[PDB]
Design an enzyme around this catalytic site. Structure first.
Site, PDB file in Angstrom:
ATOM      1  N   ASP A  31       0.756  -1.257   0.000  1.00 57.80           N
ATOM      2  CA  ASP A  31       0.000   0.000   0.000  1.00 57.80           C
ATOM      3  C   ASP A  31       0.790   1.314   0.000  1.00 57.80           C
ATOM      4  OD1 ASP A  31      -2.274   1.425   2.478  1.00 57.80           O
ATOM      5  OD2 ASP A  31      -2.056   1.857   0.333  1.00 57.80           O
ATOM      6  N   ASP A 215      -2.748   5.465  -5.018  1.00 60.22           N
ATOM      7  CA  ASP A 215      -2.903   4.443  -3.986  1.00 60.22           C
ATOM      8  C   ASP A 215      -3.014   2.972  -4.411  1.00 60.22           C
ATOM      9  OD1 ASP A 215      -5.037   4.633  -1.015  1.00 60.22           O
ATOM     10  OD2 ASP A 215      -3.338   3.328  -1.534  1.00 60.22           O
TER      11      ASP A 215
END
Length: 329
Positions: A31, A215
């Site tokens: 992430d 993201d």
């Protein structure tokens, strides 16, 4: 070094890492939107069903473990985890690095019972690391082995590899044409300036400018509740509790959606953002674009997740503090 990823339903992309001696295996999402490393702990009460359904790290089985114990809480957009800090060796794509991570002892059933993965490996900057723990990529760089201070992401379509992460470079085998970079608005956050969002033949969004968080941990492309209201209303989509649907028969007729980044138009077709589970007008088909209000200082901001990445191979350049995009292959 490369990390092979598994694609689960086009919403969860994860790879495996080893922790401790002997190595204890964990499935984790990489992430760029966060900077901490965490996996479920053996110390997690079994009353937390999510822990009963996931791989648990057991410090008492690792000869390389180093105790710390500082309490920590990680708050994500769709859920929260809590536990304490621990140190041990972690293997990632062949690379071995001593890392401080979180042993989670509180893992809510919703949403974690729905997680195929066990934990998360934050690829963000130390600036946003909770408890100021040095991020794993920083620890890898400090080793001086990577030929470049960058990492790349390739997310495939659901298929029948699910995806791939390259530490220290990019894989020309998964992109074509050349990269086009957008400098980071600020170091410490993989967020870039976005100059506009157009839906069909009307650039009625992000007029005057807005922000875009690139993201890898987000399943979908997200925007503020207001923005998504206009975007969806434009698509003729109806809102539900956790998403937007369209009658399946009209999914293919939906207009292109383009994102203006660094003087380039990144365009997605309805086939790119609609889960075309069927063509029935008697069924609802969900869209891979959601409303998500990300709090300050990072937000308000749009978030470009898997939906975007699947279409555009993405390189995160730590050295020049920017992000490069290229047509995925």
């Amino acid at each position: 070094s490369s990390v092979i990823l598994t694609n689960y339903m086009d919403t969860q992309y994860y790879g495996e890492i080893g922790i401790g001696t002997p190595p204890q295996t964990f499935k984790v999402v990489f992430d760029t939107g966060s900077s901490n490393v965490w996996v479920p702990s053996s110390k997690c009460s079994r009353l937390y069903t999510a822990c009963v359904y996931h791989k648990l790290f057991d410090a008492s089985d690792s000869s390389s473990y180093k105790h710390n114990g500082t309490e920590l809480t990680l708050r994500y957009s769709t859920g929260t985890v809590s536990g304490f800090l621990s140190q041990d060796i972690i293997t990632v794509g062949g690379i071995t690095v001593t890392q401080m991570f979180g042993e989670v002892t509180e893992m809510p059933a919703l949403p974690f019972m729905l997680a195929e993965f066990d934990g998360v490996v934050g690829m963000g900057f130390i600036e946003q690391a909770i408890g100021r723990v040095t991020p794993i990529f920083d620890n890898i760089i400090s080793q001086g082995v990577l030929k470049e201070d960058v990492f790349s992401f390739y997310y495939n379509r659901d298929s029948e590899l699910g995806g791939q992460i390259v530490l220290g470079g990019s894989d020309p085998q998964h992109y074509e044409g050349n990269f086009h970079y957008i400098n980071l608005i600020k170091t410490g956050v993989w967020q870039i300036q976005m100059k506009g969002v157009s839906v069909g033949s009307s650039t009625l969004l992000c007029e005057d400018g807005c922000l875009a968080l690139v993201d890898t941990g987000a399943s979908y492309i997200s925007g503020s509740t207001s923005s998504i209201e206009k975007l969806m209303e434009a698509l003729g989509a109806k809102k539900r509790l956790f998403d937007y649907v369209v009658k399946c028969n009209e999914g293919p007729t939906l207009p292109d959606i383009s994102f203006h980044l660094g003087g380039k138009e990144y365009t997605l077709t309805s086939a790119d953002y609609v889960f075309q589970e069927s063509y029935s007008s008697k069924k609802l088909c969900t869209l891979a674009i959601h409303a998500m209000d990300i709090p300050p200082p990072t937000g308000p901001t749009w978030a470009l997740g898997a939906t975007f990445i699947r279409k555009f191979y993405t390189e995160f350049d730590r050295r020049n503090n920017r992000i490069g995009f290229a047509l995925a292959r």
